[PDB]
Nucleic acid binder design. Structure first.
Length: 460
RNA sequence: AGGAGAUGAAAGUCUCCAGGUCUCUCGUCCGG
RNA sequence: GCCCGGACGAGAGA
């Protein structure tokens, strides 16, 4: 995250971009029944709740880059992770346009419901206008691709979500980086085969959790991290604190898999437009690009290997087991390591690592206090080899208070019941009861705790 | 400001639209 | 009924 250049769009022959300002979120019929502090993020400087300058708060996350270079440990990390991935036997060959657009085994189709990016967003062109899902006609898309070529600027948008109260006045809204459909397709065509293999193989070989079902995967994890010390921690602004050298690393891994290692320099050194400002950034993974999840994850796997090599002199990398989902990571070693000491080593690279789940200091962890993807671990009372993914009840209460689709609070409630019941019968009982304390809740179908339970057992 | 539409003979007026890459899960529907 | 395939929505997570 180093801003290199910053210009007015007109002085580069670029349009301004309409940036949305209204939230889709609104209070649900349960707004008053459950406790919660969260509210929609700030989307404009004219938000009354805002107690600071919005732009200065938005772009404050771009600091600079620490002075570091590659080194032998990073090169060892690359060598080791590269060796792992090769065992998967990934085809480095490109994929056909048809697969880039409509998907293939382990690659979803393009999202026809989201923006097409620059320049279509300034010309009233939607993805659906370029792609006819029902006839698979892509004549219009082919025409656009030729017309505007590639490496178009990503467009900065504000993410419309609930945030904690303390992110509202502070104006700490998360930003999104919109990839042009031209570029998404391009990255898919080159890297599709890699993305797919990752999607189809969550676990300790990909070093990646993307593509897992927590309800069934949670029982595999203690088998995959067979180790003695199990550990986890937190990144302060992971994506923007990625130094260009991790990108050189990622490239080296890609190269060892016989993929193209240069396209990703469009992520390291990226073009963006925010409203009427054109800018370019050196460093940081532009969350919103093609492959954010995979590339962020692959990178984490290098970092963690490097950090451990830095902190400990005689390590067995084969017994350092890692699973990552972007910035989120859980890992193990065969003996006990000092999380505190490892986190320290990230500092010289520009990484800020903190005790997992907002502790004040680093404490030991086991499958009792550790979490991944917001979920905890706890064994079934009947089958001790089956592990529940626990979910924070506070977040369930915050979630139910808001809705983006009033006419389907039923679907909403069902999604939460499937999260909640893993926490146990009596909390689930209480949840049901609170729901039915009002008329709207009693109108709703709610799955019985035992129905949920047995359905869970049948998946094993 | 751009796009789409409504209105008007026109001049004009009016209304709507815009928000990433993904994973899993649930609901509904059509299928083999 | 199970398995998979599509479509339309939603919720959570990164």
């Amino acid at each position: 995250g180093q801003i290199q250049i910053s210009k007015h769009v007109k002085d580069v022959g670029l349009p301004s971009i309409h940036t949305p300002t209204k939230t889709k979120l609104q209070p649900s019929v349960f707004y008053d029944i459950f406790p919660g502090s969260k509210e929609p993020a700030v989307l404009t400087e004219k938000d009354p709740r805002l107690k600071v300058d919005f732009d200065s708060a938005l772009f404050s996350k771009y600091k600079g880059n620490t002075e570091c270079s590659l080194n032998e440990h990073i090169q060892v990390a690359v060598a080791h992770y590269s060796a792992q991935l090769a065992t998967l036997d990934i085809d480095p060959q490109p994929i056909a346009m048809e697969d880039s657009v409509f998907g293939m085994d382990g690659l979803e189709a393009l999202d026809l419901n989201t923006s097409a990016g620059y320049p279509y967003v300034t010309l009233g062109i939607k993805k659906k206008d370029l792609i006819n899902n029902k006839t698979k006609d892509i004549s219009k898309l082919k025409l656009a691709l030729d017309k505007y070529d590639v490496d178009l600027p990503m467009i900065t948008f504000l993410k419309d979500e609930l945030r904690k109260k303390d992110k509202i006045a502070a104006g700490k809204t998360r930003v999104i980086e919109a990839s042009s459909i031209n570029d998404t397709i391009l990255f898919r065509t080159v890297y599709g085969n890699l993305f797919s293999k990752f999607h189809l193989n969550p676990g300790v070989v990909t070093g990646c959790a993307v593509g897992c079902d927590p309800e069934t995967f949670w029982s595999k994890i203690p088998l995959m991290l067979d180790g003695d010390c199990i550990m986890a921690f937190d990144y302060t602004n992971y994506d923007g604190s990625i130094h260009p050298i991790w990108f050189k690393a990622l490239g080296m891994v890609l190269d060892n898999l016989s993929f193209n290692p240069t396209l990703i320099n469009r992520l390291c050194n990226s073009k963006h437009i925010f409203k009427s400002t054109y800018y370019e950034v050196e460093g940081g993974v532009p969350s919103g690009c093609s492959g954010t999840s995979i590339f962020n994850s692959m990178i984490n796997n290098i970092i963690i290997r490097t950090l451990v090599l830095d902190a400990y002199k005689h390590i067995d990398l084969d017994k350092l087991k890692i699973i990552a989902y972007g910035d989120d990571v859980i890992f193990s070693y065969k003996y006990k390591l000092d999380m505190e000491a490892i986190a320290k080593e990230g500092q010289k690279y520009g990484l800020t690592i903190t005790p997992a789940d907002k502790s004040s200091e680093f404490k030991e962890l086991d499958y009792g206090n550790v979490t991944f993807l917001k979920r905890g671990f706890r064994q079934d009372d009947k089958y001790k080899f089956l592990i529940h993914p626990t979910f924070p009840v506070e977040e369930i209460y915050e979630s139910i208070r808001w809705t983006k689709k009033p006419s389907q609070m039923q679907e909403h409630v069902l999604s939460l019941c499937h999260l909640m019941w893993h926490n146990g019968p009596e909390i689930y009982k209480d949840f049901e009861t609170k729901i039915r304390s009002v008329s709207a809740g009693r109108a709703l179908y709610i799955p019985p705790y035992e129905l949920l339970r047995h359905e869970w057992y049948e998946k094993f």
